[PDB]
Amino acid sequence: GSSGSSGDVAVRTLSDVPSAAPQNLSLEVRNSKSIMIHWQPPAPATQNGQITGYKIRYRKASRKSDVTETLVSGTQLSQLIEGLDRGTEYNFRVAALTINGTGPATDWLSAETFESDLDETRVPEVSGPSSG
């Protein structure tokens, strides 16, 4: 057989402001006018200080210039953004904030609301035991 691959990425920059953002970012669309935001806190090692809050900003796929500012609590890992329209794409982003100032922002995640009020249901799966 055979194979071949390579890769290496890192950074050696220091500063007062934090250079780490929340992971596991998700957008649980609650309604055609509202959207639930679920994000997880960054690693501790990176955390250059205690978090005071997050800055959730979003814009319209048609109007990027138009952005909305939203500040939540520090111990808040979820925010509900209401005031949207049905059948319309919207970009959301979450950023961490600390006493040092502001932090990085999460990629631009686009979410399309529900053309109407339709609730979907899902079913779980089977799980087998084990030993060791």
UniProtKB/Swiss-Prot annotation:
Superkingdom of this protein's organism: Eukaryota
Compartments, as annotated in UniProt: Cell membrane
Glycosylation sites: 24, 100
Coiled coil start-end: none
Family stated for the protein in its record: Belongs to the immunoglobulin superfamily. DCC family.
Subunit text: Interacts with MYO10. Interacts with RGMA and RGMB. Interacts with BMP2, BMP4, BMP6, and BMP7.
Domain notes: The Fibronectin repeats 5 and 6 mediate interaction with RGM family molecules.
Protein task: Multi-functional cell surface receptor regulating cell adhesion in many diverse developmental processes, including neural tube and mammary gland formation, myogenesis and angiogenesis. Receptor for members of the BMP, netrin, and repulsive guidance molecule (RGM) families. Netrin-Neogenin interactions result in a chemoattractive axon guidance response and cell-cell adhesion, the interaction between NEO1/Neogenin and RGMa and RGMb induces a chemorepulsive response.
UniProt name for this protein: Neogenin
Species name: Homo sapiens (Human)
Gene name as annotated: NEO1
